[PDB]
DNA sequence: CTTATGT
DNA sequence: AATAAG
């Protein structure tokens, strides 16, 4: 089965990803920026208990670490933790947005390639490491009132809510898949951040290319959702479109 | 939570 | 002078 044949490639069986070929990312600040430290608005016990097991898992995974930082942004409860990074985003130097919009991206799908595989990378941003010099930028406060610990944590990986994460991830995965594209010139590979479409001319080619792509992704340290995957179908949902008989 | 954005 | 998003 696809699951048992590629244990490293699936998030369900391969563990949390880590893009081993990608250097830890340095996040340049605007020329005039200084740190901003926003105090954490009190969280209800209900919200704290809701967020707590997620924080603990991320700490166990090494994705969060303790720190002392002159930067601080608030966590809000939505329960899942959502960090308000807007004041950090304002102080980070802009980069050119290189992620294509879906309409333009799908123009690269010719009618000859009607066999599709769709893969969704799980926890994509967390696969990219942050350089230790840039980690303090993303710090937030974490309290366990019944454990005593009050102090800051920060991310060791590219965080959610950071304005440049989609572009930095798209660019990194493009670098990591450049050789795959060269080794498989008869395949069409569309990348939209963590959403991938592979297109082939035949079921057999789509099967062999999907085998090669899963093997490559897993080897590089990325992880796809086995639950959501659409493998070697003539009909798939990709980027909100239904792809069917060359349409949409 | 805060903060940017039609009748 | 309600709405979506971090």
Q: Where in chain A is the domain with CATH 3.30.70.270?
A: 2-27+95-128+158-243
Residue A57's CB: how many other CB atoms inside 10 A? Answer: 12
**Nearest nucleotide to A86, CA against C1' atoms:** C6
Retrieve residue A56's tokens.
């603990």
Cβ contact A63:A158 at 8 Å: no
Q: Where in chain A is the domain with CATH 3.10.10.10?
A: 29-91+136-157
φ/ψ bin of A236: left (φ > 0), alpha (ψ from -120 to 50), beta (otherwise)? beta
A100 is in an annotated binding site: yes
Architecture of domain A2-27+95-128+158-243: 2-Layer Sandwich (3.30)
> Distance (Å) from CA A39 to C1' B2?
12
**In Å, how far from its chain's centre is CA A53?**
21
Q: A161: Cβ–Cβ under 8 A, 6 or more apart, which residues? A: A82, A83, A84, A85
> Distance (Å) from CA A38 to C1' B3?
14
Q: Which CATH number fits domain A29-91+136-157: 3.40.710.10, 3.40.190.10, 3.30.390.50, 3.10.10.10?
A: 3.10.10.10
**In Å, how far from its chain's centre is CA A155?**
14
Record the resolution, in angstroms. 1.7
- DSSP lists the bridge partners of residue A151 as A142
Rg (CA), chain A: 20
Q: CA-CA distance, A189 to A198, in Å (whole number)?
A: 5
Experimental method: X-ray
Retrieve residue A198's tokens.
């592979």
Strand C contact with A89 (CB < 7 A): yes
Give the single-character DSSP code of A38: P
**Nearest amino-acid residue to B4, taking CA and C1':** A86
Q: CA-CA distance, A230 to A149, in Å (whole number)?
A: 44
Q: CA-CA distance, A239 to A194, in Å (whole number)?
A: 11
Residue with tokens 């060791």: A156
Strand C contact with A191 (CB < 7 A): no
Cβ contact A7:A14 at 8 Å: yes
Retrieve residue A229's tokens.
């995957």
- Strand B bases contacted by the protein (CB, 7 Å): 1-4
A84 is in an annotated binding site: yes
Strand C contact with A82 (CB < 7 A): yes
Q: A9-36 as b/e, with b when 16 or more CB fall inside 10 Å? A: bbbeebebbbbeebeebebeeeeeeeee
**Angle, helices A203-220/A165-183, rounded to nearest 10 degrees:** 130
Residue A168's CB: how many other CB atoms inside 10 A? Answer: 20
Cβ contact A125:A157 at 8 Å: yes
- Strand C bases contacted by the protein (CB, 7 Å): 6
Cβ contact A177:A153 at 8 Å: no
């Amino acid at each position: 089965t696809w699951l048992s044949d590629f244990p490293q490639a699936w998030a369900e069986t391969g563990g949390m990803g880590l893009a081993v070929r990608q250097a830890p990312l340095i996040i340049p600040l605007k020329a005039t920026s200084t740190p901003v430290s926003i105090k954490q608005y009190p969280m209800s016990q209900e919200a704290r208990l809701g967020i707590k097991p997620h924080i603990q898992r991320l700490l166990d995974q090494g994705i969060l670490v303790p720190c002392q930082s002159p930067w601080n942004t608030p966590l809000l409860p939505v329960y899942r933790p959502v960090q308000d990074l807007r004041e950090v985003n304002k102080r980070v130097e802009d980069i050119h947005p290189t992620v294509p919009n879906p309409y333009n991206l799908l123009s690269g799908l010719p009618p000859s390639h009607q066999w599709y595989t769709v893969l969704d990378l799980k926890d994509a941003f967390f696969c990219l490491r942050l350089h230790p010099t840039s980690q303090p930028l993303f710090a937030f406060e974490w309290r366990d009132p019944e454990m005593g610990i009050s102090g800051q944590l920060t991310w060791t990986r590219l965080p959610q809510g950071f304005k440049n994460s989609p572009t930095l991830f798209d660019e990194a995965l493009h670098r990591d898949l450049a050789d795959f594209r060269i080794q498989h010139p008869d395949l069409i590979l569309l990348q939209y951040v963590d959403d991938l479409l592979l297109a082939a001319t035949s079921e057999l080619d789509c099967q062999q290319g999907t085998r090669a792509l899963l093997q490559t992704l897993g080897n590089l340290g990325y992880r796809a959702s086995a639950k959501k995957a659409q493998i070697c179908q003539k009909q798939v949902k990709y980027l909100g479109y239904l792809l069917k008989e060359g349409q949409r």
